[PDB]
Amino acid sequence: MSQERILDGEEDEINHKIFDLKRTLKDNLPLDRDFIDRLKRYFKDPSDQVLALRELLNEKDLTAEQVELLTKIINEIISGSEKSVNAGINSAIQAKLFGNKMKLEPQLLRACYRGFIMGNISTTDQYIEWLGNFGFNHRHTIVNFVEQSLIVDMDSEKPSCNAYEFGFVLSKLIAIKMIRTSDVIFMKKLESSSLLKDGSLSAEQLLLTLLYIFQYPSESEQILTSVIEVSRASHEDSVVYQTYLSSVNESPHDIFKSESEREIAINILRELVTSAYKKELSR
């Protein structure tokens, strides 16, 4: 129940730590001083620390009322860190589930969900972040992991957030799904345009390029410069611009700050298309 949600080390390695703390409590019956230092040394993560102490409370040898002298350690760790601790505990199983699927270290996922419900960066900055931390191939699965954890988090006896906060989280989640939606669309356009066949252009770099457009529509042209310096060797400008324009048109509207911001992006990309298609006549 508690040992399974510990994401620090191998199954035996974990067990080699719990019993020692049970040892310093049952047959030795010593005091609690450097005990905490050893606990923290064994487990660097507060969630894993609490889980270890909870397992200690599952032993048969109740030495009477030292339960309160042990639960004070549980509450001292939790107090003032209720959000982080609970976020780690509740999403542990999912971290192990998705970790095996994606071939990623579970505790990395715990940090992911932890940071998501505790941070306050924009929707686009989040997508970008997850991209850089977990890679191109995991970008759609990572959002699924966060969703699954949120569901479990909510159904937990001691959730990480309150009713109000979970609403905001969801709202952020939906914003992310919209980005994933445009991402999926953008990728389909790249395939049909045959911009990935050459092998010179990176779909990750192109994805980020689209993401920058969302944040700074006024600087669209400047942003696309990086792509042009590579696409010119094989493809024609109008083709790259069309991919971005048609993608933006078919993507959800609320990805942009506002209606006017979106039109700034569209008009600029519209002008870019015309200009390139014109220069293609003098060739």
Author numbering: 73 to 355
Question: What does the primary publication say about this deposited structure?
Answer:
The pathogenicity of Shigella sp. is dependent on a complex macromolecular machine, the type 3 secretion system (T3SS), that delivers into host cells a set of effector proteins required for invasion. Blockage of effector secretion before host cell contact is mediated, in part, by a protein that has been proposed to act as either a physical impediment to the entrance to the secretion apparatus, or as a gatekeeper that determines substrate hierarchy. Across bacterial species, this protein (known as MxiC in Shigella sp.) possesses only weak sequence homology and in some species exists as two separate polypeptide chains (e.g., in Yersinia sp. the homologue consists of YopN and TyeA). MxiC is an elongated rod-shaped molecule with a long axis of 86 Å.
In order to improve the quality of MxiC crystals, a shortened construct encompassing residues 74–355 (MxiCNΔ73) was expressed, purified and subjected to crystallization trials. It is the first two domains of MxiC that are equivalent to YopN while the third domain of MxiC, equivalent to TyeA, is connected to domain 2 via a ten-residue linker. There are a total of seven independent MxiC molecules in the crystallographic asymmetric units of the three refined crystal forms. These structures reveal that, although the fold of each domain is maintained in all structures (rmsd over Cα atoms of domains 1, 2 and 3 are 0.5 Å, 0.9 Å and 0.8 Å, respectively), there is some flexibility at the interfaces between domains resulting in a “wobble” of the terminal domains about the central domain (rmsd over all Cα atoms of 1.4 Å). This region is buried by crystal contacts in all seven independent molecules of MxiC in the P212121, P222 and P43212 crystal forms, suggesting that this region may be a “hot spot” for protein–protein interactions. Surprisingly, the most striking difference instead involves the long á-helix (α9) in the central domain of MxiC, which is straight in all of our MxiC structures, but possesses a sharp kink in YopN when complexed with TyeA. As the sequence at the hinge is not conserved, and all MxiC molecules possess the straight helix conformation, these structures may represent genuine differences between species.
